[PDB]
Amino acid sequence: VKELLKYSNETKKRNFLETVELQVGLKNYDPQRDKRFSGSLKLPNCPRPNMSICIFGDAFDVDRAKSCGVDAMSVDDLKKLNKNKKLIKKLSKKYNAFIASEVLIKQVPRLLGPQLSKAGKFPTPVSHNDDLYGKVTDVRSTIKFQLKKVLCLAVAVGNVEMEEDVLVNQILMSVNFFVSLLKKNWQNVGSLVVKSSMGPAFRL
Amino acid sequence: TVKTGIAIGLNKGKKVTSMTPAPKISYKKGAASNRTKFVRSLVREIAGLSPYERRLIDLIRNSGEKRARKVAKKRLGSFTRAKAKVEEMNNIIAASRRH
């Protein structure tokens, strides 16, 4: 365990020079080699909200589209001949449904800048259409890593103190154990600095 | 550890009432005595370390006990003696830090 609650208990309130959305990332260090098998993975279970500004191009157009309105952010239909080449840029997560299985034509010319292609990294043809929306839309990186490592997602917003970041940490921070080998260290979330925009720096 | 009574299996042999004979003293040849412990410790203090033991010390400090055990197995004969030498070097390191 990282914190019973030590050194990170209330020190996100008295630093309220910015009460605005204070999203602090979690970066720490472990190298790996040139392959692309089992690096940055792991959508975890973590219950805080994100109050994000994201967009969801969820694709299903039965009149549950405005039930997708209360499940998600926006609805897309498969009219794809000249919709998009340079639009999808501000996003945390995306989602599709029963129509977007064979959309290869609208796929490589626009889903290559940020590379949100429906390979084994982005399973958007979703049937399970009401549980992984308001709680899982929070920051959790399901990306593909660099030549060394990518570890960054916010554990808590500035309005959320860490009464929940004592149940988030080691449901989350057993991170790469379910696939990867132990070339990495044993729970290598180590030296951390909580600093959204005004938070100080504290060291183990 | 009693026998089964038949000619094969895990504990084969005839069931005979055992005796548990008296322990022989020659079975305690390698036992460490107080005098021998004292003498060996004092000789270690006044003699210090050998060159390969010093390079084992810095190998444990820097490059880890696996390479230390590999070097000790190459230097000494066996992996068992390498393990024993490495763990007593670890105890030496702990005592030097406490000193």
Binding site: - | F38, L42, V43, E45, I46
Partner: protein
């Protein structure tokens, strides 16, 4: 054995033992058991002390009350000379002393390099 049993009050160790490993452990043992020791010149002197040729070591383990005070005032200097200087003589390497001609040569090279 007397030192191990802490029965010795004062130990004298001869300095000219020809296997020095007969007595190299004796100062450390005396420091460990807390008995006071003194490295002294002459195993022959110790031999005449104990009616032998050489003795290589001697030890007073129990003295009479007429000169226990003399033993105390003696050991108060002996321990200051040896026991209390033990942990600093333990670090110093002796030897490495050059001959007369080589010493003159190296200090001539020193006052050669001392041009300023």
């Amino acid at each position: 054995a007397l030192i191990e049993n802490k029965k010795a009050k004062l130990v004298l160790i001869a300095n000219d033992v020809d296997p020095i490993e007969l007595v190299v452990f004796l100062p450390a043992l005396c420091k460990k058991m807390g008995v006071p020791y003194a490295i002294v010149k002459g195993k022959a002197r110790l031999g005449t002390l104990v009616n032998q040729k050489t003795s290589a070591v001697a030890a007073l383990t129990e003295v009479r009350a007429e000169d226990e005070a003399a033993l105390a005032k003696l050991v108060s200097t002996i321990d200051a000379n040896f026991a209390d200087k033990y942990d600093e003589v333990k670090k110093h390497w002796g030897g490495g002393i050059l001959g007369n001609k080589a010493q003159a040569k190296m200090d001539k090279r020193a006052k050669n390099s001392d041009s300023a």
